[model samples]
Target: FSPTLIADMAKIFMDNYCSPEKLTGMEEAIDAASSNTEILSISDPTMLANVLTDGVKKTISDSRVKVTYEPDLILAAPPAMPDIPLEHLAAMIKGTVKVEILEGNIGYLKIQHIIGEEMAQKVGPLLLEYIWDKILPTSAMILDFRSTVTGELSGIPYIVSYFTDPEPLIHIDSVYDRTADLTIELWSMPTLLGKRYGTSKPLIILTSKDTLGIAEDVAYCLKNLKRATIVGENTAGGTVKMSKMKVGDTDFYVTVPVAKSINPITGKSWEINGVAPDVDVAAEDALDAAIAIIKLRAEIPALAQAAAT
Candidate 1:
């Protein structure tokens, strides 16, 4: 928590933030904090981290922009799959995917950490295959993201393809990387490993404050496409994909968002907006709330058929 290190981080933020137009106050806050003798006297690392965190937010605040005592714990955007053994891949995939079936035959898929297509490419060659197939028998389905936090841009399209049609592939979203001054388009793939959810059969997504960038996109895409109902509280309000950079000659690192997601349906990033829920409930209540909706929706097909009898 030295003044020199604080100044370096300020420079890093000034040089790297996705929105350069939004920060004059951050500059001022850094200048004040880095020079104050009294402020520099703080002995506690947590206190100094908080001081820097509060100082930055005084001007421009984004959830993705915060300081921690340690290097980034949960990476928002990790690099491509590392070179590793096959056994490790299966355990990695299994940790991310938790599939279950509840009463009324509701299919549930809980993805913890989303690493994207590469995950389904190798060992789980058919894991994405296995995931959807496991749930295909259920009348209604729930995609749980309440426990998910970190993710990749590839993660968005992979999850979305299952809920869309192949005949007319959709232009799902776009990402603008401010650092590169380039924008890339994302379209739903025509082919997938598993049977497509096919835009029908009541799909519900469970979200919480824990849901981060790509997780928000999965829910947002389905909601905008009118394919799924989002049940939960407001998401984490971070649509910008973050990355970690080693600070100058120090073990400390700074995590900053480099890319902003733009949904083709809405033409903008969620950013601080935090994907809102259609059915508002506390994070704890979201599962129970979604179950009721499924029960309500599941009966229509059976009830309609019974009316003829």
Candidate 2:
């Protein structure tokens, strides 16, 4: 590849994909790359792509700056979202939202995914009802979301409401579209039915690189609100809602992020950097770490009561 090819790629990225700040140095970076003997010597597309996208914070591209020269290779279309019947979907949902009473009275609820707001409203209560008695006397609770992949945003508030009481609903976050024509505000509900987890108890949430989409949103809300301690690897860092775009005349398509999430507490969005863990640990180490914390937390009340006596 010649300097001209790399220069052209850099221009496309700057004009269409690179972040606002990166755009300022675009011309200078391109000129520098064009004159650099080392950069021109590299013929690998992936390496070139990385150099072009260096220092870009957020990008709306289908592929990570990996350049593959085989442009005409036919690519398979992405699979469509499945349509499961209500009865079957309900059964699947029940299996995914599991409740267990760990040793030392630690309540554990592993939520794989929230199907939708309507489904959550229907099945959400039943989940708490089944686990309420088991968790009522527990000193702390753990909500594991490491395996959660996708969910609806509306369903997040419904799930969070279970752990919080009726109130004016604190602001969680807001999302703005690419054109700013649409704004979606995520707020806590004024009230929630079923048993409440109460804000006093220790709530631990488990996350991994697998935790994404609305599942990440739920973790973000509880974490920023000081309602839960997040443990695990940093999330997938994909908070923006996405849509697919056709690439010029090619059959290939690119998924572009159209919306961005802005947290009210930090006044920063988790679009690229993702939600950092309060206690960072390997994804495999998260569960044990959370259990250790829960055990320590569970012993506090008993120790205080003994002191009082």
Candidate 3:
């Protein structure tokens, strides 16, 4: 509510913002927000967060930052990361996914957000041993990550590892972090929980304009690896690794774009122009498109029989 708090937030943005070159309108944005009488008059923290969110949108101008009011959790990012432990991981994955089987025995996994990699070491076992055993056996699978705004950069490796080969481990992606001044490389796990769905079976990933952050990365990685058929609209193209940071001495927080995503295979990020789908359709129609594609690919010897080799 005070000018000092806004100044602190602006300082944090200037100091830790991932894209320094994109700071053109940010200073003026902060000044305007600070000077506004109506905005300054607001006493409620939640309302102030909304004000900050709007002001940030005006500042970055590219749909970059987000302001949050009383958040349950916030990830500091890959460098200063956390341990998953079973309880924490369990809470993140709890009720986030809806699993079901289609008419053709096609497995469906609709995830609201891809869970974080806090438990990367044991996530393979946790997911397969508990959550994913039933769907792994399906003839084909449709994995959905088409959310309005969800997913974490930390969770990218764990989920994508489920579809890639265990041997000849590859460095899938990298994160160029500004806050820590380090480039963290993300590699495919050398091992997985049980057995991978493997490259032989049909794996279709559903996406939309809403699919952002790590979800967009998952689609882009699998697409580049030639591991899955992407359906639905092009993603939201927000590849920046976001971390929620509290405004000093304030009741609000801002989502800082701490780092940017870089896919090793592409030599660039899935930023701004999000990952495009191989089979494009409406978001609602993505699952149906995937089911149809799997059914078509099923009869063909190429997709279903390739597993034997």
Candidate 4:
């Protein structure tokens, strides 16, 4: 619903900001579609409309999906950080993950960017499946953090499967309370075959300034369980959950500190401050630190010496 609505709004944006000569074509499109009630409400037509007349009709029809239309809706964007560098906003090229087979044949899949829960779930399995079927028994895995995914309540859970054992309840927080609805329930997760496979190997996660939202939560879970060693920098230091609110031609995400992520081991929520790494390493070189730990285990060749608890 949001995607369709966003598409509609994009037209309005393009009409206002795009080439001046296109204004005549945009006005004509609106005039020609005057009979259509839906187009009548939309402020600008350039964003969605292509050069073809039929394309406009098809684009408008996409709104018929289950999403509730809030023509008056206007979602407020996040507060602008003008001080931030301009280069930070530029999009990176895709399919650029640089994989290195670390010591013990442990693979390191460092994605350049982060995707939604669905894509996270997809690529993780694909990588593991290849390792299981093609590669020999490996020792561990390292996932380089990308500060890309910023939203979603369950983003952490989707990522945890690559590192943890299968249990009915995945730890959302060791302890958390917010406003009047203070809850400490251990949330149940989808336990698939991957959990069993992942549990066999050590999972070392790397965190940096780029990791935020549910990805930050993933770091919290791994640290709490002691199942993975988190290296590199601390998190982006935000844990508030928010949802998209449509207010009459505007879209806004109402972020409130409704819940906090806690360390299952120490029993403290990760709010205000992020999860700290046991071995503090620089962001650029954190994966190497995790790889070194895995290598130490392989050379030691004993569980007692490897865990060193």
Candidate 5:
């Protein structure tokens, strides 16, 4: 934690961070810290690191940036997927899609991840078929995207198609790569299961702060189309597709956002501003609220039927 070393690290941080509009006070903090003779004289490394991090944050207004130290290891591209036993395939697919019949005959589908279209078809349709056979008998259904940690781009439209009509094929989303100067359109395809597999069912999508990427795309699309009542917290707001770039053969690498998602309906990107929930609730209470809506919808019809009976 020498003064010279601290000053050099501060320089590195300022140089690397994307510059801001106003850095009036930040520069003063950095200069003051650099000039402090007792900066390196601090005994606690953790305290000194925090002091420096605060100094950097002062430059950027409400910046979400923080520093972490890691051992310098030889960095290279990650290895390919390892070969595994075929017997584990069933369990793997099961991990991706989970379905349950909740109270009031409500169907709950929890997707953990969305893989490539090939893989999605291998697993997604079967689950959809199961829901059509088993859960469609229910008064309503809930698709939980909170657990959907990550998903492939192709997987979004594939799954969305199951709940959307075929005649008016909807443009789901568009991926714009400013780096490559290209825009790729994604349109919903006709599902193998029929024009609208379970579109008529009262579909409620549950989202949370963990909902991200193409999962956010699905939520935004469904909510915009009035197909599902999105009940939960705002999503994580990360729709940008990123690529890793090596710092000119240096071990240090940076993940640059190569592409952004534009919601066709909104004509806007859900990049940092995540999809807002229709009925905002804590992640824990989101499911309960959805169930209540389903039960309420069912009760009215069932009440009328009972009176007729």
Candidate 6:
């Protein structure tokens, strides 16, 4: 659907369930933004929402002027929920591989997902030959699991051989500059690496509302070490301890914020709102920053950087 249609419908829905006054300035901003011939065209719902909200909130003063919506809004469940879609699970599972040369004259071999030991073993030998076991021993080896959600203890040590020396990846900045032009409800430390999983290079992760549960835990762990940078948007402010309770074929997931996470370095917890990114880019262009970071590592012109700024 077109952006105009999506915004109008979404705004109307917001007025119905939440507050009609919440969207007054949005209508004006949408009209004004559309009239700007120089502004780049944006089509994604998330992007449109960010742009509209950012524009409107700028002119409105009260920090209390927060408008919210669930990207995945659901009706209150009185009855049974349907069966899980295998396709949905499949979509959440995937793998990726990256090979490049970076600082310290080392080649980078990044396997995005840890599907299983078999896949890891299969890809290891080929990478060891071409990427890892080159004429030069390589300055540092990298195994990127930022995209992987690994909660297993069975395959821990095998991945740690890559980084011999671990150091802080990037410096974080003041939150004032970071959240200046944004509406950040949640924040957390970036996920740098899983030392227990045997990773050498610090693992930096970017988060959004989607990062939750174990994901946030991982991010919190990594950021405390100052080993990784938290980039992109803040996470959904959900610092609650969770447990799964099933009743009559309905699985209920409970999330409650328990406490604040203080950064060991700064003696601050990432629990309340969340830790902001060291480099705070627009949520609309976070995907762009990811690509650019990849390119910067590769010493290539990052398209993500170009599109973002």
Clashes of each: 1, 0, 0, 15, 0, 17
Task: State the lDDT at 189 in candidate 4.
Answer: 57
RMSD of each: 5.0, 5.3, 7.0, 16.9, 6.1, 16.3
lDDT (0 to 1) per candidate: 0.78, 0.69, 0.78, 0.53, 0.70, 0.41
lDDT of 4 by residue, 186-225 (tens): 4535664343436657777888866776666667777777
Better of 1 and 4 by lDDT: 1
Per-residue lDDT over 28-84 for candidate 3, one digit per residue giving the tens place of the 0 to 100 score: 778887888888898887788787878777557756677767755555566866755
Best by TM-score: 1
Better model by lDDT: candidate 3 vs candidate 5: 3
Residue 214 error, candidate 5, Å: 1.9
**Could you estimate the TM-score for every candidate?**
0.74, 0.71, 0.68, 0.52, 0.70, 0.34
Better of 1 and 2 by TM-score: 1
Between candidates 2 and 5, name the one with more favorable lDDT.
Answer: 5
Off by over 4 Å in 5: 1-88, 123-132, 193-195, 301-309
Query: Over the stretch 90-183, how does candidate 5's per-residue lDDT look in tens digits?
Result: 4687766778899777888888877667765555455445545666566678999876768888877776787877758789888876556677
Of 4 and 5, the candidate ranking higher by TM-score: 5
Per-residue lDDT of model 6, residues 1-309, tens digit only: 244443453343333221234345655665666665433465444554455455555854323222233344455678876865544433333235465665544444544443333433444444444434451344333333334333321122233223223333322211211112222122222341222223443344566654443344445545554545566666554432321211122222111111223333565545446556655766556544655664466553476688778
Which pairs in model 1 have colliding backbones? 124-127
Question: By summed lDDT, which 10 consecutive residues of candidate 1 come out lowest?
Answer: 120-129
Candidate 5, position 148, lDDT? 74
